[PDB]
Amino acid sequence: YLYLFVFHSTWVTRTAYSSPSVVLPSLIDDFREAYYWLRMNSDEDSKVAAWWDYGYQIGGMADRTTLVDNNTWNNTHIAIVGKAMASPEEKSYEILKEHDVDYVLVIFGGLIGFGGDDINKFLWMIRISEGIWPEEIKERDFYTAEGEYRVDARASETMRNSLLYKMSYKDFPQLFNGGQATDRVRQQMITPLDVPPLDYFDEVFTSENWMVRIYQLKKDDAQGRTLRDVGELTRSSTKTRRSIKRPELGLRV
Amino acid sequence: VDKFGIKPEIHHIFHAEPKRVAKPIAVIFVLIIFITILSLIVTWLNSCAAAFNNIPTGVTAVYFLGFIATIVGFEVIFARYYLGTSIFETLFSSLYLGAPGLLTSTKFLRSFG
Amino acid sequence: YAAATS
Amino acid sequence: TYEQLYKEFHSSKSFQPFIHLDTQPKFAICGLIVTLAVLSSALFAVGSKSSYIKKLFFYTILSVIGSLFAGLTTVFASNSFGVYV
Amino acid sequence: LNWFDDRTWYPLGRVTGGTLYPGLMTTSAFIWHALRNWLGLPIDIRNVCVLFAPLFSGVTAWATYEFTKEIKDASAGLLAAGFIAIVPGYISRSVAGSYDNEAIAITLLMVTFMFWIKAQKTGSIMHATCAALFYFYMVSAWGGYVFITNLIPLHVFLLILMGRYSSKLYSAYTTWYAIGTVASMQIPFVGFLPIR
Amino acid sequence: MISDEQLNSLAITFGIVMMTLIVIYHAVDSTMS
Amino acid sequence: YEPPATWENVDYKRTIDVSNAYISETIEITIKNIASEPATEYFTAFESGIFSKVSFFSAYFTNEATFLNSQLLAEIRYGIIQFPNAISPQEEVSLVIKSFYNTVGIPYPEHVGMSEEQHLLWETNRLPLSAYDTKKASFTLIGSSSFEEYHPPNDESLLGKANGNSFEFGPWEDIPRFSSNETLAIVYSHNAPLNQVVNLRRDIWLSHWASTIQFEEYYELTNKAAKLSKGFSRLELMKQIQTQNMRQTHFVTVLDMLLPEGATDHYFTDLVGLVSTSHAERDHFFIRPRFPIFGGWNYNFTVGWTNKLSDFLHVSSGSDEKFVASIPILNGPPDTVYDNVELSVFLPEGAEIFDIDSPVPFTNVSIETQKSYFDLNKGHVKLTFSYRNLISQVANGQVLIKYDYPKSSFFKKPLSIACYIFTALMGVFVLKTLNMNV
Amino acid sequence: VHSHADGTSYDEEPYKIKDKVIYSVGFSEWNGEEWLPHIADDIQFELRQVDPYYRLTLSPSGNDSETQYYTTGEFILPDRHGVFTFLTDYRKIGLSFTTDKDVKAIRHLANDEYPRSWEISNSWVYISAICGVIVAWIFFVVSFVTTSS
Amino acid sequence: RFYSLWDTNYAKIHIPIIASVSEHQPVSWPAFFFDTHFLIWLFPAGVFLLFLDLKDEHVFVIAYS
Ligand SMILES: *[C@@H]1O[C@H](CO)[C@@H](O[C@@H]2O[C@H](CO)[C@@H](O[C@@H]3O[C@H](CO[C@H]4O[C@H](CO)[C@@H](O)[C@H](O)[C@@H]4O)[C@@H](O)[C@H](O[C@H]4O[C@H](CO)[C@@H](O)[C@H](O)[C@@H]4O[C@H]4O[C@H](CO)[C@@H](O)[C@H](O)[C@@H]4O[C@H]4O[C@H](CO)[C@@H](O)[C@H](O)[C@@H]4O)[C@@H]3O)[C@H](O)[C@H]2NC(C)=O)[C@H](O)[C@H]1NC(C)=O
Ligand SMILES: CCCCC/C=C/C/C=C\CCCCCCCC(=O)O[C@H](COC(=O)CCCCCCCCCCCCCCC)COP(=O)([O-])OCC[N+](C)(C)C
Ligand SMILES: CCCCC/C=C\C/C=C\CCCCCCCC(=O)O[C@H](COC(=O)CCCCCCCCCCCCCCC)COP(=O)([O-])OCC[N+](C)(C)C
Ligand SMILES: CCCCC/C=C\C/C=C\CCCCCCCC(=O)O[C@H](COC(=O)CCCCCCCCCCCCCCC)COP(=O)([O-])OCC[N+](C)(C)C
Ligand SMILES: CCCCC/C=C\C/C=C\CCCCCCCC(=O)O[C@H](COC(=O)CCCCCCCCCCCCCCC)COP(=O)([O-])OCC[N+](C)(C)C
Ligand SMILES: *C(=O)c1ccc(-c2c3ccc(=[N+](C)C)cc-3oc3cc(N(C)C)ccc23)c(C(=O)[O-])c1
Ligand SMILES: *[C@@H]1O[C@H](CO)[C@@H](O[C@@H]2O[C@H](CO)[C@@H](O)[C@H](O)[C@H]2NC(C)=O)[C@H](O)[C@H]1NC(C)=O
Ligand SMILES: *[C@@H]1O[C@H](CO)[C@@H](O[C@@H]2O[C@H](CO)[C@@H](O)[C@H](O)[C@H]2NC(C)=O)[C@H](O)[C@H]1NC(C)=O
Ligand SMILES: *[C@@H]1O[C@H](CO)[C@@H](O)[C@H](O)[C@H]1NC(C)=O
Ligand SMILES: [Mn+2]
């Protein structure tokens, strides 16, 4: 039994407890690749807004300021980030801008099949924000009308319009040829029309296996109009305006 | 009429420094403590008998002085620490004093007992 | 097992 | 002068190693043994309880030999593990 | 010890002085300084941080050897040390690369327990002081020191109820409590928690 | 450097050597005491 | 400071080549001696900005194969050429002057898409800038597929014709000296990454005990090509790669370093860890950065390898304990421009440097000592050469060092380790025979 | 520019809670011919974390030839520590908008920057107790090894 | 967290961040084998054997266990 103990212990140590975390064995080096890009091609004072789980790693490898870390002394702050990721892009933009955030980082495992992606941690963010602000983020709206957590063509309108969803599935269907892509952690089909355009954020980096995706807040319009209007202008195909009708705008101060 | 007009001034409101007692009361209590120490030191030498009979004599006296010098000298170190010197200086001074003191104190205690 | 969300 | 130094370099013989790197690992596995033996004897020379002077004599000579062997072993082992000295 | 990092929790910041346990870092820094200044080999700080846990695994094995040697014999101590060296349960949180608090913490725990048992059965002030100093080291290293703070009293309490009170017990416990408690209120994180 | 398989062999070799030596210690200690 | 001694340029032919990540110039001048007194020197003229970054300056005789003495004299700044023999009062001499500069043109449209080819804009003087009157001239731009001019002047004479890939500017036949009132801006095509190394740090460690010379280079690299318009899209990059877009590109995906023969123990890491995409072939070390370096991106990495000391260290004949070492100056990618180089040769503790030589001029030499893994006495001798503008293939020189390493100093390393172990053992002895029992 | 009240900079001494600092900034106008000094009384300065902790009206103090300088007099930094922004946002209608920002870190108080024990009277009492105990312990040890039983 | 060790359902009710981290969850029987093979059956025995011969050291070990 003692010799069996030696053998069992060595096998257990080799198989399960000796795996590194920064590099998934295949090597998949997406984490370090994205963090190094952030370290080399971003301003030294820039701030990165991601989930708490990946705070320490960023500070160690990206060497950039972080809103939240693995140590969780303040829970309202983490709730703020969770609200910033479970709400429509306008609200997210306003909240993140109010905290001088430059970049947003998301983890996506749809291609490889990571399983530790943000979409497999979204229901927790919605919970934590729900605690602080019970009237704005409601967990019962990220489900279908039947109670199902779907990321398919049968997702809730609130799901499809959240920041995390629209920022993780961007340009995904156009990857898999034919005009329809297939996820590999949730096993559902995403079509090019299931993903609305992002009008407040730019993509600046996407790792090689599409595991880390880094977006950058775009500066507000010089003309002082909502970025959704700039978008709906740059998209809507040129056509004659409907008519000239007196605008309902109120009273000028 | 948002962010178009001069804005009201804001001024931070600070807390209060905790109240320290008036020096007369502290002086009275310091005197009480000093009197207590003196009363102890005299109770030993008077009502109680601290005989001081067996003062060491011969070569053992040298070890006795070495022992007393380690005993007072560690306290001198700790006072030199309370008054500003660094932990590293207080950690090297202790080593220097301790090694010959660890030899001479053990020797006194071995001889006398 | 690590300090991360499940 | 670049010309003079260059001519001296080219018309000269190349470096020859004292002990080739390939053979140095074996020397380490031999030197370790010798040090282990001598040092162990030295460690077993502080219990002899024969004579303080005899203990000092034995310990000192054995320690000297062991120290020289250990220094050589350290150099050979360092070189053999890829940390060149 | 007086470090405010402005690169974490950006609006608020973090005062690391009173939100961090300073003993793993201090031990690593001491090993680094010792290797480069005295022994003469200047290894990197990443390498010391990586190979910190493998180094203290042997210390934990020796501590287990002594602790078991205090309960039965030296043979049982050798068996215990052999078991703890390769046991997957300990290995899980102490593989080369793992640099959390547990790496050194579970070593100090066994050392503290060794001294406590040596102090309780013998009845000596010196071993109780050694236990108190290592308990301080654990307080400064990990946040699960509270286990010791509630296990050493419990043992003593049971010994009172089974009728096995002696003077060795008074001496050992009072000396451990006094020195350990006054010394564990010096870590800024702990503060005045021991009394309130 | 040393390969993974060789590391596995070294780990198991050290473990077996350790266990046998401990068993020998126990046997001698029990018989002689 | 117009040069007093005078010459006359009978023919001044200038050819500027733009096919690399730098500018190479070749001026073929025939000079006559205006002055009756025999003249021995010639002064060439550079502007201020161009003289600030000129990497290689050379001059030679058209007929002969020898290199005339040529220096840079330190606001038309000058360089001085020195003729081997005194030139007669009236006589003609033909020289070919060759210069390599550290400047390339800026992209004319600063932002281009991943696929589009890049066009670069270069600004220079069209008319010969000289300190001596010129009776004929030409200027020919070679090395790019397309040459066009930005803001061409009205005059027909100041215009360029295209023969093959060249852009000839036509033979002028009367040029005043010191006349630089004309500016030429030319846009040329380019489809290559403009690799700039901001700083390079080279460490070369010599070890006598193990006959191995180890090289470790830290690169700070940046691509100077056109920035990516509309941002970086992984989708576009993958679509390019899958369709076998094997044409030319202006972003860096793989770097092919050329190492000395027989190299072993290759490694390629960066500040975050060991990169795995690094194929070592025969004397070539292919390296793939983590992320493709597009226009304006920074990548800092470290490469390293090991060689044999017998290939670089030679022993002097008169004394067995004096050594001469010749060390290469650059072992980098094929086409690259360096802006600062700090070459540090580490020598064993005993060595005492005796003579030093560098083929290219340096900006600073310093000798100090830096400790190492078993340095228990003082440390390795560190000799550092600082250089400024160096080009990948022009700068092929070898630093020569002569040092004295006595046999007494070879054996001292074991002895020092032995003295440490001996003192530790004596300390154990004292600690073991000193009773402290009360 | 912002500095300590005594002229010390931020690099020589990083800011600490409840410190006294001065903020100054200058302005200039373009009549279309020459830059001149801009005399305005509406300019304000804000020290913000995410919401204004200090809003102070800047006062004219010191004119150059082409510029006029404004200053907030010495003010004490908050007792709250963190990363605070020093902001001057001039946004008047008809005029050009000018924004100046500067994120600085306001540290907490270190361990050695608290008042020492000999300066608090309550501490006087407790120090007296500690000294009396150390002195009595020394006397005790000398007497325990001297006096025969 | 110490209260949570007695009121097992407490975490989810109030603190929602403690119940998201995988580290603070119960363990199924297989894990007490995967980690201490052979020792796990032999430990409950050693506790009984130390209980038949109570000493102060043994009282310690028993409480710990
Ligand atoms: C964890 O993270 C979270 C989020 O990241 C951190 O939480 C944030 O903490 C902030 C400060 O601690 C807090 O901001 C305060 O909120 C107060 C309440 O806001 C709500 O109510 C008000 C109406 O009362 C609404 O307007 C508002 O929209 C909210 O609904 C505000 O009252 C605070 O305002 C005061 O402070 C700010 C900042 O200094 C001033 O700009 C403002 O003018 C107010 O100033 C008064 O008080 C200060 C002292 O605080 C005085 O210096 C000043 O002169 C003013 O004093 C007058 O008024 C007071 C009474 O207020 C009176 O006594 C005095 O005599 C004067 O008359 C401020 O806005 C954030 O809201 C909060 N965020 C969230 C999401 O919770 C949390 O700190 C982190 N945890 C940590 C760090 O441990
Ligand atoms: C205060 C006294 C402390 C007590 C110690 C006793 C005194 C004697 C001193 C040391 C003797 C041996 C020390 C050598 C260990 C360094 C190896 C290293 O660090 O190797 C690391 C990685 O290892 C390896 O490759 C193999 C790992 C094997 C290590 C062996 C472990 C035995 C010792 C364990 C604990 C050692 C304690 C030291 C650190 C806490 C270097 O990897 P790298 O990426 O940096 O370079 C790699 C080389 N490129 C540049 C080409 C990339
Ligand atoms: C026979 C006689 C022997 C005497 C007894 C010896 C040992 C008793 C042990 C208990 C010590 C209690 C507290 C000590 C405070 C030391 C820190 C310090 O010193 O930091 C202090 C304050 O920081 C702290 O609170 C820090 C909290 C403590 C952190 C300790 C580090 C943790 C590591 C533990 C083990 C380290 C081992 C390393 C390698 C093995 C500043 O010091 P300073 O340089 O400003 O000093 C100037 C002198 N002022 C005091 C007048 C200004
Ligand atoms: C007291 C009893 C000690 C017993 C030790 C027993 C066994 C040790 C077994 C294995 C440890 C070495 C295995 C890993 C080898 C590669 C490490 C590596 O590659 O890392 C090294 C640094 O690491 C080390 O210094 C390893 C130290 C090796 C020590 C070897 C053991 C013999 C000496 C024992 C202690 C004697 C102390 C005497 C003091 C007077 C990476 O250096 P670098 O990145 O600068 O690359 C070099 C690039 N230049 C050179 C261009 C800068
Ligand atoms: C209480 C004491 C502690 C007991 C033991 C503790 C820890 C040891 C357990 C496990 C260590 C795992 C080994 C991993 C090392 C990876 C590197 C490697 O395996 O290097 C192997 C080399 O190996 C060997 O030839 C072994 C050398 C034989 C050494 C003789 C015994 C060692 C003596 C050490 C202490 C001597 C000091 C004496 C006085 C203080 C391959 O390296 P490479 O091909 O890259 O060489 C680079 C290429 N050239 C060859 C050109 C350089
Ligand atoms: C903590 O939550 C946790 C620790 C370990 C494991 C685990 C593995 C994780 C990563 C692995 N690699 C990427 C190599 C392999 C793992 O192997 C395991 C095997 C078992 N067995 C045999 C029952 C159990 C756990 C691991 C996990 C995990 O992913 O399950 C989680
Ligand atoms: C990687 O190398 C680049 C190139 O030298 C470094 O860039 C310089 O960084 C300093 C400080 O950030 C700036 O002042 C210089 O202007 C930068 N130079 C260029 C050309 O951009 C960069 O700092 C290095 N990065 C790391 C992490 O070491
Ligand atoms: C050349 O030598 C060195 C190159 O590093 C420089 O002088 C030293 O620079 C270091 C850099 O920190 C300083 O610490 C030293 O004080 C300088 N002097 C010495 C003697 O080391 C400098 O660039 C040049 N020195 C010259 C030309 O004298
Ligand atoms: C500054 O002083 C006043 C304005 O306050 C006025 O005389 C003029 O604008 C300036 N004079 C000088 C000498 O700068
Ligand atoms: Mn932890």
Numbering used by the authors:
A (entry chain A): 458 to 483, 492 to 718
B (entry chain F): 170 to 282
C (entry chain P): 2 to 7
D (entry chain C): 2 to 86
E (entry chain A): 67 to 262
F (entry chain B): 1 to 33
G (entry chain E): 25 to 98, 111 to 474
H (entry chain G): 270 to 418
Tell me, in the authors' exact words, what the paper reports:
Oligosaccharyltransferase (OST) is the central enzyme of N-linked protein glycosylation. It catalyzes the transfer of a pre-assembled glycan, GlcNAc2Man9Glc3, from a dolichyl-pyrophosphate donor to acceptor sites in secretory proteins in the lumen of the endoplasmic reticulum. In higher metazoans and fungi, OST is a multimeric complex composed of eight subunits spatially arranged in three subcomplexes that are formed during OST assembly. Subcomplex I contains OST1 and OST5; subcomplex II contains OST3 (or OST6), STT3, and OST4; and subcomplex III contains OST2, WBP1, and SWP1.
We performed single-particle cryo-EM analysis of a sample containing nanodisc-reconstituted yeast OST, MnCl2, chemo-enzymatically generated Dol20-PP-GlcNAc2Man9Glc3, and the non-reactive peptide TAMRA-YA(Dab)ATS-NH2, where the acceptor asparagine was replaced by 2,4-diaminobutanoic acid (Dab)31,41–43. The generation of the substrate analogs TAMRA-YA(Dab)ATS and Dol20-PP-GlcNAc2Man9Glc3 enabled us to visualize a ternary complex of eukaryotic OST, and well-defined EM density covering bound peptide, which allowed us to build the complete hexapeptide chain. Intriguingly, clear density was also observed for the attached TAMRA fluorophore in a pocket formed between the subunits STT3 and OST3, a location that would accommodate the nascent polypeptide chain N-terminal to the glycosylation sequon. The side chain of the Dab residue is lodged in this tunnel, with its terminal amino group positioned at a distance of 3.3 Å from the C-1 of the reducing-end GlcNAc of the glycan donor. This suggests that our structure reflects a state preceding the nucleophilic attack on the reducing end GlcNAc, akin to a pseudo-Michaelis complex. In this conformation, two residues from the EL5 contribute and complete the active site of the enzyme: Glu350 and Arg328. The second, Arg328, provides a salt bridge with the pyrophosphate group of bound LLO. This interaction is not present in the binary complex of OST with bound LLO state, where the pyrophosphate group only interacts with Trp208 and Arg404. The manganese (II) ion is coordinated by residues of the DxD/E motif47 (Asp166 and Glu168), the catalytic residues Asp47 and Glu350, and by the pyrophosphate group of the LLO. Upon binding of an acceptor peptide, the complete EL5 and TM9 become ordered, resulting in a catalytically active state.
